[PDB]
């Protein structure tokens, strides 16, 4: 499962310059090792400090204050494909940031065939008010007292035979 | 026979009772027909013709746009 880890950067302090630039950033990854690897990869491109000269000080997890509150997360993404890299922006309705980023990755794999290697997370923020959701398919769920059915339900059974031929009513 | 035989016939009897409607419908179907043919060696010729027409139209529009 995905997770959020916070990492900082204080590339080894040269003489008379302790704690340089306090390079703080947030990383989304499953385990700590992957989080550190992605942090190093991002640092190697955002600036010119190499991993050999760098040093990880501390890694702390950041959960969600209200993991039971539905939010319309705004997602800014920079990724690359067979063509040159280009920024992208998307909005996802999810309870938690980790779930939102997981669905973002799944959608990117679905439509854009992208993966963790080619996906870079720019920033994630919550939409504080309605009508700010540009994407129509996300604003759709924000209507007053939205109610819809689920026609043609699917079902599974352990037995390989049935004498009823049940209907898909739902 | 005469210098305007078909022209005389057209001017004296016009065209079919629904020639205008049929021609308008056929022209309307051109957009659908072109798209259908684009997806159905002839493909190379069709693509080349479409690209040439697009290039010519774009050039004509761009050159004449200088008037404004």
């Amino acid at each position: 499962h995905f997770k959020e880890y916070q990492v900082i950067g204080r590339r080894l302090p040269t003489e008379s310059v302790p704690e340089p630039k306090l390079f703080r950033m947030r990383i989304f990854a499953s385990n700590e090792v992957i989080a550190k690897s992605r942090y190093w990869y991002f640092l190697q491109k955002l600036h010119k400090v190499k991993k050999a000269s760098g040093e990880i000080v501390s890694i702390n997890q950041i959960n969600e204050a209200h993991p039971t509150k539905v939010k319309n997360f705004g997602v800014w993404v920079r990724y690359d494909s067979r063509s040159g890299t280009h920024n992208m922006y998307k909005e996802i309705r999810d309870v938690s940031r980790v779930a939102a980023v997981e669905t973002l990755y799944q959608d990117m794999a679905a439509r854009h065939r992208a993966r963790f290697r080619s996906i870079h997370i720019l920033k994630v923020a919550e939409i504080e008010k309605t009508a700010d959701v540009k994407r129509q398919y996300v604003k759709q769920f924000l209507t007053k007292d939205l109610k819809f059915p689920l026609p043609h339900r699917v079902q599974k059974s352990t037995k390989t035979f049935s004498y009823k031929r049940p209907s898909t009513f739902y | 026979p005469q210098n305007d035989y078909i022209e005389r016939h057209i001017k004296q009897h016009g065209k079919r009772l629904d020639h205008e409607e049929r021609k308008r419908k056929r022209e309307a179907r051109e957009s659908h027909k072109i798209s259908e043919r684009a997806q159905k060696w002839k493909g190379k010729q069709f693509a080349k013709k479409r690209y040439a027409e697009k290039v010519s139209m774009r050039k004509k529009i761009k050159a004449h746009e200088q008037s404004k």
């Binding site: - | 001017k11 004296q12 009897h13």
Partner: protein, 172 residues
């Protein structure tokens, strides 16, 4: 888009440039008639535009937005109300027929004419027309009626300019 700003500024400037503000109920008239009305005098100016734009422009002044909705013809004039209303109620022009706007015109069952044969004429809609090896060959009208009348140059529409509301530029 910027065309709306032009009308906005023109109205907001000409509001105080004339003694009286009047609204005219005209929305379908031939341009030559409108030009003749405009040039009939120099002390008044014809104002037209989008109804909503006029509502937004017309608050600039007390009770100005009340009659603005009855414009989209609007007239700025300095002459007395009596002269303007006398001209409006006396001025009349036989314009082209408009949809559902009474003569006994009837198309003869025989050859058709530019005027429909009403005058003693120059030989030339879903009606059962047919071509007689070069010629074309009753029908009556009293929206298709307006089109038929226009095709024959009939101008039975005796349109007259009218005024709806009165507003004072200095006292509303």
């Amino acid at each position: 888009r910027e065309n709306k700003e032009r009308i906005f500024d023109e109205v907001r400037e000409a509001l105080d440039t004339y003694r009286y503000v009047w609204v005219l109920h005209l929305d379908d008239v031939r341009t030559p008639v409108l030009q003749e009305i405009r040039t009939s005098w120099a002390g008044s100016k014809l104002i037209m535009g989008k109804r909503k734009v006029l509502q937004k422009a017309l608050e600039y002044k007390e009770n100005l937005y009340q009659l603005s909705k009855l414009c989209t013809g609007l007239l700025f004039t300095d002459e007395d109300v009596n002269t303007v209303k006398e001209y409006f109620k006396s001025y009349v022009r036989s314009d082209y027929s408009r949809p559902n706007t009474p003569l006994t015109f009837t198309i003869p069952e025989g050859i058709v004419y530019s005027r429909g044969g009403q005058i003693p004429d120059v030989p030339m809609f879903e009606i059962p027309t047919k071509i007689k090896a070069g010629k074309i060959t009753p029908y009556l009208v009293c929206v298709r009626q307006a089109l038929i009348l226009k095709q024959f140059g009939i101008a039975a529409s005796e349109f007259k300019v009218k005024v709806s509301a009165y507003y004072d530029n200095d006292s509303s």
